[PDB]
Paper text:
DUX4, a member of homeobox protein family, is exclusively found in placental mammals. Compared to other homeobox proteins, DUX4 contains two adjacent HD1 and HD2 domain, connected by a short linker of 15 residues. Very recently, using next-generation sequencing technologies, a novel B-ALL oncogenic driver DUX4/IGH, derived from the insertion of chromosome fragments containing DUX4 gene into the IGH locus, has been reported in ~7% of B-ALL patients. In order to investigate how DUX4/DUX4 fusions recognize DNA, we have determined the crystal structures of Apo-DUX4HD2 and DNADRE-bound complex at the resolutions of 1.5 and 2.6 Å, respectively.
The Apo structure is a classic homeobox fold with three α-helices, termed α1, α2, α3, respectively. The N-terminal α1, α2 helices are anti-parallel. The α3 helix is perpendicular to the axis of α1/α2 helices. Compatible with its DNA binding activity, the electrostatic surface of Apo-DUX4HD2 reveals a highly positively charged pocket delineated by residues Arg137, Trp141, Arg145, Arg148, and His149 in the α3 helix.
Author numbering: 5 to 54
Amino acid sequence: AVTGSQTALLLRAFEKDRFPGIAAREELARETGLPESRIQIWFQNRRARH
């Protein structure tokens, strides 16, 4: 699971760039302190639900 702060940051990103490319995902990884693969999973999962 990701933290509340990470969720808030990722959701705001998702609502501006719904399909981040690898550079954007690596940047979100650095912003959040999450691995890039975890960023990708989070976006894939959210899009599969929406």
